[PDB]
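Re: [help] complex structure
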Amino acid sequence: ETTDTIYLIPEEYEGDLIVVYNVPGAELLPKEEEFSVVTFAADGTAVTSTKNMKFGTVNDLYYTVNKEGQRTKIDSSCIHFSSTGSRTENSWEFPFANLEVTRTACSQEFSANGREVPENQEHPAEKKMRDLMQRIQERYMNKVK
Amino acid sequence: ETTDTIYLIPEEYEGDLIVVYNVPGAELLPKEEEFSVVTFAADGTAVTSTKNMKFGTVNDLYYTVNKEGQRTKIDSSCIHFSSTGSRTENSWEFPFANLEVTRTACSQEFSANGREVPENQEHPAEKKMRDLMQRIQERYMNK
Amino acid sequence: ETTDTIYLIPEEYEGDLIVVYNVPGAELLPKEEEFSVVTFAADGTAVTSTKNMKFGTVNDLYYTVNKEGQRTKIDSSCIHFSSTGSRTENSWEFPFANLEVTRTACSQEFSANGREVPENQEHPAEKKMRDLMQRIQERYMNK
Amino acid sequence: AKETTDTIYLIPEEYEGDLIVVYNVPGAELLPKEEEFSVVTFAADGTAVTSTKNMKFGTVNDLYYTVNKEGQRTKIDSSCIHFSSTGSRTENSWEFPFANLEVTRTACSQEFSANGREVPENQEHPAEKKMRDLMQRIQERYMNKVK
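Output below.
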């Protein structure tokens, strides 16, 4: 068994990426063949009602997309898989994934560690996540079950 | 419902800090979990419509923030909590808080007393406050 | 014969760097000891009236600078020396230098090749240069 | 020994930070004397330039004061002062002895006295630039086309 996920990144984007699952009201991940398709918004965020991500041998594919939706494959060395987890708001669990993309510095070093960031400062993805959760709670959870 | 407070200071700022509450028209303090979030402007000032502060400094957290908003925790020795009170302009009460931050002299001395200032002279924060009240009255109290 | 040049880059900048020489009206490169000092503007551009750059064995030093001008040395692995040449506008020749800086990917690979860019498409520095020449013509060439 | 440093430093009351004294600068004023002490008066930028050949040596008995616009002095504790370094800088074949000190109003303490203010790790110390600029002002004002 494999991860079978396709990630579509806006071509002009560079940086941290976040996918949040099990978000009610959100769209489900479309399927193309055996792959689930994650489409990131211009801010590198993706929200879906799909219950969770897949676990298994990583065989994900990554592409950048222009405004018209035409895809351009990116090498794995341009992608860094940072972390996964779950966040509980109220009693509802949202699994999530943190990735990072580059156009400038594709390399094995990047794939393993992502971009170099300041020492004591929190990682920029923490803020992106912090803000994304708020957007989620406001747009999708606001006085609803 | 909150219990504690998070203070966000611009990384390049140094000196006195003032937070003024119950300012109508001002933004309310955002909430992150159980903490209220105070974001200081470049001049070390923060104005909010939140009725009042959380009574206690106990477990507050402090951070500096870059332009992009990424946070960096500050050692407690770099922060001094000075005073709280209320100021009445007309018949309207504004609760406030005075704190002080440093980058260059973090120390236990600083944490306990803030920077050393002249003896027979008003603390510089008094003028900062005096001027802040005026900016408040002009932009919010009669706009 | 050595290059003897000090490059001062704004700490927040990342990407292509361009230095253009023999620009009349522009400031001359200050001199510190045996080194010429190039100070880049926020857009990674530097314009000077110094007739030309020095040629020889590269012994340049690189630093990032905060708003106050304090320097922080950066490793050579964060810098890529791309190219040099001359560009003629009207009948006037402007020697130039193309460098590239990174914070994200300092490495020996970067030092030798700079960041990876698309194959057939023009290098992004070509546009930066194209635009810089226009700014030069407008602000300094007449005027 | 009977040899002491006998120096009085006058700092503008509003100044805080790095201090530099440069000696053996021709054309500059000589250090005035008050009793047995030499008097260093810093300019508003915390710089002092003098034609006095060198700083004094011996048992340290220096006094420090801040001064208002009217010139009235206010003694400051030694804990408000950090003596950073001394040396000599050679331009051409001319030697300029110098001294680096630092003053604070905010944080007088033993820690400060011993280490001066906390500055960023990889960055050069702010005094390096102050010195760099001061030497240039010296070369330019006191000797561009002069001997």
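Chains D and A do not touch (no CB pair under 8 Å).
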